[PDB]
Design a binder for these strands. Structure first.
Ligand code: G2P
Ligand code: MN
Ligand code: MN
Ligand code: NA
Length: 320
DNA sequence: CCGACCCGCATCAGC
DNA sequence: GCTGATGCGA
DNA sequence: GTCGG
Protein backbone atom coordinates (compact mmCIF):
# COMPACT_ATOMS: atom_id res chain seq x y z
CA UNK A 1 0.00 0.00 0.00
CA UNK A 2 1.06 3.64 0.76
CA UNK A 3 0.36 4.99 -2.77
CA UNK A 4 2.61 2.01 -3.70
CA UNK A 5 1.11 1.85 -7.16
CA UNK A 6 2.24 5.34 -8.00
CA UNK A 7 5.60 5.16 -6.25
CA UNK A 8 6.53 1.96 -8.10
CA UNK A 9 5.48 3.43 -11.47
CA UNK A 10 7.52 6.51 -10.72
CA UNK A 11 10.54 4.52 -9.55
CA UNK A 12 10.24 2.39 -12.67
CA UNK A 13 10.03 5.53 -14.82
CA UNK A 14 13.16 6.75 -13.03
CA UNK A 15 15.27 3.65 -13.68
CA UNK A 16 14.47 3.94 -17.37
CA UNK A 17 15.59 7.59 -17.39
CA UNK A 18 18.97 6.82 -15.82
CA UNK A 19 19.73 3.53 -17.47
CA UNK A 20 18.16 3.99 -20.91
CA UNK A 21 17.53 7.68 -21.45
CA UNK A 22 20.76 8.69 -19.72
CA UNK A 23 18.67 11.56 -18.37
CA UNK A 24 20.06 11.76 -14.87
CA UNK A 25 17.99 14.75 -13.74
CA UNK A 26 14.66 13.35 -14.98
CA UNK A 27 15.60 10.23 -13.01
CA UNK A 28 16.13 12.36 -9.90
CA UNK A 29 12.85 14.25 -10.55
CA UNK A 30 10.88 11.02 -10.77
CA UNK A 31 12.52 9.40 -7.66
CA UNK A 32 11.84 12.74 -5.82
CA UNK A 33 8.14 12.94 -6.70
CA UNK A 34 8.20 9.27 -5.61
CA UNK A 35 9.80 9.92 -2.23
CA UNK A 36 7.37 12.82 -1.64
CA UNK A 37 4.18 10.95 -2.72
CA UNK A 38 5.52 8.28 -0.36
CA UNK A 39 5.33 10.68 2.60
CA UNK A 40 1.95 12.15 1.58
CA UNK A 41 -0.41 10.61 3.89
CA UNK A 42 -3.53 10.11 1.80
CA UNK A 43 -4.56 7.75 -0.98
CA UNK A 44 -4.05 10.01 -4.00
CA UNK A 45 -7.27 9.87 -6.02
CA UNK A 46 -6.28 12.41 -8.72
CA UNK A 47 -3.36 13.69 -10.78
CA UNK A 48 -4.37 17.24 -9.91
CA UNK A 49 -4.29 16.24 -6.25
CA UNK A 50 -0.76 14.93 -6.55
CA UNK A 51 0.13 18.13 -8.50
CA UNK A 52 -0.38 20.08 -5.24
CA UNK A 53 2.67 18.35 -3.80
CA UNK A 54 6.16 19.72 -4.45
CA UNK A 55 8.16 17.76 -6.95
CA UNK A 56 4.98 16.76 -8.81
CA UNK A 57 4.51 18.71 -11.98
CA UNK A 58 2.21 18.22 -14.92
CA UNK A 59 3.78 15.23 -16.67
CA UNK A 60 3.83 13.09 -13.52
CA UNK A 61 0.33 14.36 -12.82
CA UNK A 62 -0.72 13.22 -16.31
CA UNK A 63 0.82 9.82 -15.58
CA UNK A 64 -1.01 9.43 -12.26
CA UNK A 65 -4.27 9.88 -14.16
CA UNK A 66 -3.51 7.19 -16.75
CA UNK A 67 -2.45 4.91 -13.90
CA UNK A 68 -5.42 5.57 -11.58
CA UNK A 69 -7.78 5.26 -14.56
CA UNK A 70 -6.36 2.10 -16.22
CA UNK A 71 -4.25 0.40 -13.55
CA UNK A 72 -1.39 0.58 -16.04
CA UNK A 73 1.06 2.97 -17.68
CA UNK A 74 1.06 2.26 -21.40
CA UNK A 75 4.50 3.84 -21.70
CA UNK A 76 5.92 1.51 -19.05
CA UNK A 77 4.19 -1.42 -20.75
CA UNK A 78 5.89 -0.64 -24.05
CA UNK A 79 9.25 -0.21 -22.26
CA UNK A 80 9.06 -3.55 -20.43
CA UNK A 81 8.39 -5.47 -23.66
CA UNK A 82 11.13 -3.69 -25.55
CA UNK A 83 14.01 -6.14 -26.03
CA UNK A 84 16.66 -3.43 -26.37
CA UNK A 85 15.55 -1.28 -23.44
CA UNK A 86 14.78 -4.31 -21.23
CA UNK A 87 18.42 -5.44 -21.73
CA UNK A 88 20.21 -2.10 -21.34
CA UNK A 89 18.19 -1.79 -18.15
CA UNK A 90 19.01 -5.25 -16.93
CA UNK A 91 22.78 -5.13 -17.55
CA UNK A 92 22.99 -1.98 -15.45
CA UNK A 93 22.39 -4.36 -12.53
CA UNK A 94 26.00 -5.59 -12.98
CA UNK A 95 28.31 -3.34 -10.92
CA UNK A 96 30.72 -1.68 -13.31
CA UNK A 97 28.04 -1.47 -16.00
CA UNK A 98 26.41 1.96 -15.94
CA UNK A 99 24.01 3.14 -18.67
CA UNK A 100 26.88 3.87 -21.06
CA UNK A 101 28.39 0.37 -21.19
CA UNK A 102 24.96 -1.28 -20.94
CA UNK A 103 24.20 0.37 -24.27
CA UNK A 104 27.50 -0.62 -25.88
CA UNK A 105 26.85 -4.21 -24.80
CA UNK A 106 23.31 -4.32 -26.19
CA UNK A 107 24.43 -2.61 -29.40
CA UNK A 108 26.78 -5.54 -30.00
CA UNK A 109 23.96 -7.89 -29.12
CA UNK A 110 25.42 -8.76 -25.73
CA UNK A 111 22.19 -8.63 -23.68
CA UNK A 112 22.32 -11.28 -20.92
CA UNK A 113 24.48 -12.59 -18.15
CA UNK A 114 25.15 -15.63 -20.34
CA UNK A 115 26.28 -13.29 -23.11
CA UNK A 116 28.50 -11.44 -20.66
CA UNK A 117 30.22 -14.59 -19.35
CA UNK A 118 31.27 -15.63 -22.86
CA UNK A 119 32.56 -12.08 -23.55
CA UNK A 120 34.96 -11.80 -20.59
CA UNK A 121 37.58 -10.04 -22.73
CA UNK A 122 35.05 -7.23 -23.41
CA UNK A 123 34.72 -6.64 -19.66
CA UNK A 124 37.04 -4.39 -17.71
CA UNK A 125 38.17 -5.60 -14.31
CA UNK A 126 35.24 -4.17 -12.37
CA UNK A 127 32.52 -5.58 -14.63
CA UNK A 128 34.19 -9.00 -14.36
CA UNK A 129 33.76 -9.00 -10.61
CA UNK A 130 30.26 -7.59 -11.03
CA UNK A 131 29.27 -10.57 -13.12
CA UNK A 132 31.10 -13.15 -11.00
CA UNK A 133 29.17 -11.99 -7.90
CA UNK A 134 25.98 -10.82 -9.59
CA UNK A 135 23.90 -12.93 -7.25
CA UNK A 136 25.64 -12.25 -3.96
CA UNK A 137 25.81 -8.50 -4.42
CA UNK A 138 22.04 -8.25 -4.77
CA UNK A 139 21.51 -10.36 -1.66
CA UNK A 140 20.86 -8.37 1.50
CA UNK A 141 23.20 -8.93 4.43
CA UNK A 142 21.57 -9.47 7.83
CA UNK A 143 22.59 -7.24 10.73
CA UNK A 144 23.82 -10.38 12.50
CA UNK A 145 26.30 -10.65 9.69
CA UNK A 146 27.02 -6.90 9.70
CA UNK A 147 28.13 -7.42 13.32
CA UNK A 148 30.34 -10.39 12.43
CA UNK A 149 31.57 -8.15 9.60
CA UNK A 150 32.14 -5.33 12.07
CA UNK A 151 34.17 -7.43 14.56
CA UNK A 152 36.65 -8.57 11.90
CA UNK A 153 37.28 -5.03 10.61
CA UNK A 154 37.65 -3.34 13.97
CA UNK A 155 39.77 -6.29 15.17
CA UNK A 156 42.10 -6.28 12.15
CA UNK A 157 42.42 -2.50 11.89
CA UNK A 158 43.59 -2.16 15.47
CA UNK A 159 45.96 -5.08 14.85
CA UNK A 160 47.62 -2.85 12.25
CA UNK A 161 47.72 0.27 14.36
CA UNK A 162 46.05 0.90 17.74
CA UNK A 163 45.62 4.50 16.73
CA UNK A 164 43.32 3.90 13.76
CA UNK A 165 39.61 4.59 14.20
CA UNK A 166 37.14 2.58 12.11
CA UNK A 167 33.37 3.17 12.11
CA UNK A 168 30.84 1.13 10.06
CA UNK A 169 28.59 3.96 8.86
CA UNK A 170 25.77 3.62 6.32
CA UNK A 171 22.51 1.66 6.58
CA UNK A 172 24.20 -0.09 9.53
CA UNK A 173 24.76 3.12 11.53
CA UNK A 174 21.08 3.81 10.88
CA UNK A 175 19.90 0.78 12.89
CA UNK A 176 18.61 -0.83 9.65
CA UNK A 177 17.78 -4.47 10.25
CA UNK A 178 19.71 -5.31 7.05
CA UNK A 179 22.17 -3.55 4.74
CA UNK A 180 23.34 -3.73 1.12
CA UNK A 181 27.09 -3.12 1.39
CA UNK A 182 29.49 -2.54 4.23
CA UNK A 183 30.33 1.17 4.33
CA UNK A 184 33.29 1.84 6.65
CA UNK A 185 34.91 5.11 7.77
CA UNK A 186 38.61 5.16 8.67
CA UNK A 187 40.71 7.76 10.49
CA UNK A 188 44.32 7.85 11.65
CA UNK A 189 46.30 10.66 13.30
CA UNK A 190 49.07 10.92 10.68
CA UNK A 191 46.50 11.83 8.00
CA UNK A 192 44.98 15.27 8.73
CA UNK A 193 43.66 17.99 6.39
CA UNK A 194 46.83 19.90 7.18
CA UNK A 195 49.37 17.15 6.55
CA UNK A 196 49.96 13.51 5.58
CA UNK A 197 52.44 12.31 8.22
CA UNK A 198 52.29 8.71 7.00
CA UNK A 199 51.70 6.95 3.67
CA UNK A 200 49.88 3.72 2.74
CA UNK A 201 47.50 4.22 5.64
CA UNK A 202 44.64 2.83 3.60
CA UNK A 203 46.93 0.28 1.91
CA UNK A 204 48.00 -1.27 5.25
CA UNK A 205 44.38 -1.79 6.28
CA UNK A 206 43.44 -3.30 2.90
CA UNK A 207 46.46 -5.64 2.82
CA UNK A 208 45.74 -6.79 6.41
CA UNK A 209 42.08 -7.49 5.65
CA UNK A 210 43.40 -9.20 2.52
CA UNK A 211 46.02 -11.09 4.50
CA UNK A 212 43.38 -12.58 6.83
CA UNK A 213 41.26 -13.64 3.80
CA UNK A 214 38.47 -11.19 4.60
CA UNK A 215 38.72 -8.98 1.49
CA UNK A 216 38.61 -11.23 -1.58
CA UNK A 217 38.61 -8.84 -4.55
CA UNK A 218 39.36 -5.24 -5.37
CA UNK A 219 37.19 -3.01 -7.53
CA UNK A 220 39.05 0.26 -7.07
CA UNK A 221 41.85 1.24 -4.72
CA UNK A 222 43.28 4.67 -4.15
CA UNK A 223 45.08 6.57 -1.42
CA UNK A 224 41.78 7.47 0.27
CA UNK A 225 39.02 5.23 -1.09
CA UNK A 226 38.60 1.48 -1.37
CA UNK A 227 35.80 -0.37 -3.11
CA UNK A 228 35.90 -4.08 -2.65
CA UNK A 229 34.48 -7.55 -2.01
CA UNK A 230 34.63 -9.42 1.34
CA UNK A 231 33.39 -12.66 2.92
CA UNK A 232 32.71 -13.92 6.46
CA UNK A 233 34.80 -17.00 7.32
CA UNK A 234 32.55 -20.02 7.28
CA UNK A 235 32.38 -23.14 9.44
CA UNK A 236 33.50 -26.74 8.76
CA UNK A 237 31.34 -28.66 6.21
CA UNK A 238 29.12 -25.56 6.22
CA UNK A 239 27.61 -23.32 3.50
CA UNK A 240 29.79 -20.41 2.32
CA UNK A 241 28.42 -17.00 3.40
CA UNK A 242 27.64 -14.79 0.37
CA UNK A 243 30.20 -12.41 -1.11
CA UNK A 244 29.62 -8.88 0.05
CA UNK A 245 30.48 -5.36 -1.03
CA UNK A 246 32.65 -3.16 1.17
CA UNK A 247 33.60 0.48 0.80
CA UNK A 248 36.43 1.95 2.92
CA UNK A 249 37.02 5.72 3.12
CA UNK A 250 40.05 7.39 4.72
CA UNK A 251 38.91 10.78 5.97
CA UNK A 252 41.23 13.37 7.55
CA UNK A 253 40.78 13.11 11.31
CA UNK A 254 39.96 16.86 11.50
CA UNK A 255 36.93 16.34 9.24
CA UNK A 256 35.81 13.11 10.93
CA UNK A 257 32.30 14.33 11.60
CA UNK A 258 31.72 15.77 8.13
CA UNK A 259 32.56 12.25 6.94
CA UNK A 260 30.22 10.47 9.36
CA UNK A 261 27.23 12.64 8.41
CA UNK A 262 28.08 11.86 4.78
CA UNK A 263 28.79 8.07 4.89
CA UNK A 264 25.80 7.57 7.19
CA UNK A 265 23.46 9.01 4.57
CA UNK A 266 20.96 8.29 3.40
CA UNK A 267 21.59 9.30 -0.22
CA UNK A 268 18.08 10.69 -0.69
CA UNK A 269 18.51 12.31 2.72
CA UNK A 270 21.99 13.53 1.81
CA UNK A 271 20.81 15.32 -1.33
CA UNK A 272 17.78 16.47 0.76
CA UNK A 273 20.13 18.04 3.34
CA UNK A 274 22.64 19.35 0.82
CA UNK A 275 19.82 21.00 -1.16
CA UNK A 276 18.63 22.67 2.07
CA UNK A 277 22.15 23.95 2.88
CA UNK A 278 22.30 25.87 -0.43
CA UNK A 279 19.01 27.74 0.22
CA UNK A 280 20.02 28.41 3.83
CA UNK A 281 23.26 29.77 2.33
CA UNK A 282 25.68 26.91 2.92
CA UNK A 283 27.61 24.13 1.12
CA UNK A 284 28.01 20.75 2.89
CA UNK A 285 30.42 18.06 1.64
CA UNK A 286 32.10 15.08 3.28
CA UNK A 287 35.05 17.30 4.31
CA UNK A 288 33.59 20.72 5.16
CA UNK A 289 30.60 23.02 5.39
CA UNK A 290 31.35 26.41 3.96
CA UNK A 291 29.59 29.78 3.81
CA UNK A 292 32.26 29.38 -0.61
CA UNK A 293 34.37 30.62 2.27
CA UNK A 294 36.59 29.12 4.92
CA UNK A 295 35.83 25.86 6.80
CA UNK A 296 33.21 26.37 9.49
CA UNK A 297 34.28 24.55 12.70
CA UNK A 298 32.66 21.23 13.54
CA UNK A 299 32.80 19.01 16.65
CA UNK A 300 29.38 17.29 16.40
CA UNK A 301 27.06 16.04 13.70
CA UNK A 302 24.27 18.25 15.18
CA UNK A 303 26.63 21.22 14.64
CA UNK A 304 25.93 20.85 10.94
CA UNK A 305 22.18 20.58 11.53
CA UNK A 306 21.83 23.84 13.43
CA UNK A 307 23.75 25.66 10.69
CA UNK A 308 20.83 25.04 8.30
CA UNK A 309 18.06 25.32 10.92
CA UNK A 310 17.49 21.53 10.97
CA UNK A 311 16.39 19.72 14.08
CA UNK A 312 18.90 16.91 14.67
CA UNK A 313 17.60 13.71 13.07
CA UNK A 314 19.02 10.67 14.96
CA UNK A 315 20.89 8.41 12.49
CA UNK A 316 17.92 5.94 12.72
CA UNK A 317 15.59 8.65 11.22
CA UNK A 318 17.86 9.67 8.28
CA UNK A 319 16.11 6.99 6.16
CA UNK A 320 14.54 9.38 3.65
C1' DC B 1 11.99 30.67 -22.27
C1' DC B 2 15.50 28.70 -20.23
C1' DG B 3 18.96 27.10 -17.16
C1' DA B 4 19.72 24.39 -12.68
C1' DC B 5 19.50 20.49 -10.50
C1' DC B 6 24.34 17.47 -4.05
C1' DC B 7 33.42 13.57 -4.99
C1' DG B 8 37.31 9.44 -5.55
C1' DC B 9 38.91 5.99 -8.78
C1' DA B 10 39.42 3.69 -13.44
C1' DT B 11 39.49 4.20 -18.19
C1' DC B 12 39.73 6.60 -22.19
C1' DA B 13 40.74 10.70 -25.66
C1' DG B 14 43.90 13.21 -26.96
C1' DC B 15 48.44 15.71 -26.92
C1' DG C 1 54.85 9.79 -21.10
C1' DC C 2 51.61 13.28 -19.88
C1' DT C 3 46.59 16.03 -18.99
C1' DG C 4 41.96 16.21 -18.97
C1' DA C 5 37.22 14.21 -19.93
C1' DT C 6 34.09 10.68 -18.90
C1' DG C 7 32.02 6.72 -16.74
C1' DC C 8 30.73 4.65 -12.45
C1' DG C 9 29.57 4.36 -7.98
C1' DA C 10 29.45 5.93 -3.76
C1' DG D 1 10.81 16.12 -15.04
C1' DT D 2 10.22 20.24 -12.22
C1' DC D 3 11.00 24.56 -10.65
C1' DG D 4 12.09 29.13 -10.37
C1' DG D 5 14.63 33.38 -12.57
N1 G2P E 1 25.46 13.10 -1.19
C1 G2P E 1 25.38 11.73 -1.61
N2 G2P E 1 25.77 10.68 -0.69
C2 G2P E 1 25.69 9.26 -1.12
C3 G2P E 1 25.25 8.93 -2.38
N3 G2P E 1 25.28 7.60 -2.49
C4 G2P E 1 25.74 7.10 -1.32
N4 G2P E 1 25.99 8.16 -0.49
C5 G2P E 1 26.47 8.12 0.86
O1 G2P E 1 27.19 6.73 1.14
C6 G2P E 1 26.48 6.12 2.04
C7 G2P E 1 26.47 4.64 1.74
O2 G2P E 1 26.39 4.40 0.32
P1 G2P E 1 25.31 3.30 -0.20
O3 G2P E 1 25.29 3.32 -1.72
O4 G2P E 1 25.74 1.89 0.25
C8 G2P E 1 23.62 3.69 0.44
P2 G2P E 1 23.17 3.10 2.14
O5 G2P E 1 24.35 2.85 3.05
O6 G2P E 1 22.47 4.27 2.81
O7 G2P E 1 22.13 1.81 2.08
P3 G2P E 1 22.43 0.21 1.70
O8 G2P E 1 23.01 0.08 0.33
O9 G2P E 1 21.11 -0.60 1.74
O10 G2P E 1 23.37 -0.39 2.66
C9 G2P E 1 25.05 6.74 1.88
O11 G2P E 1 24.33 6.57 3.00
C10 G2P E 1 25.40 8.18 1.67
C11 G2P E 1 24.84 10.05 -3.35
O12 G2P E 1 24.45 9.78 -4.44
N5 G2P E 1 24.91 11.41 -2.95
MN1 MN F 1 25.43 1.30 2.59
MN1 MN G 1 28.36 2.26 -0.32
NA1 NA H 1 25.83 -1.18 -12.53
Amino acid sequence: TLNGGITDMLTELANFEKNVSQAIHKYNAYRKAASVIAKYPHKIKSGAEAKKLPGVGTKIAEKIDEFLATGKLRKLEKIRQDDTSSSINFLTRVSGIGPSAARKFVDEGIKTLEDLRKNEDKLNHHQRIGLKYFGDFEKRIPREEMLQMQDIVLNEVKKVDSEYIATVCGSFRRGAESSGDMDVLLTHPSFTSESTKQPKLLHQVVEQLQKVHFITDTLSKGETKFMGVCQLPSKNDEKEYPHRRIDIRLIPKDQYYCGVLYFTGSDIFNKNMRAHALEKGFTINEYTIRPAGEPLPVDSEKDIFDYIQWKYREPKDRSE
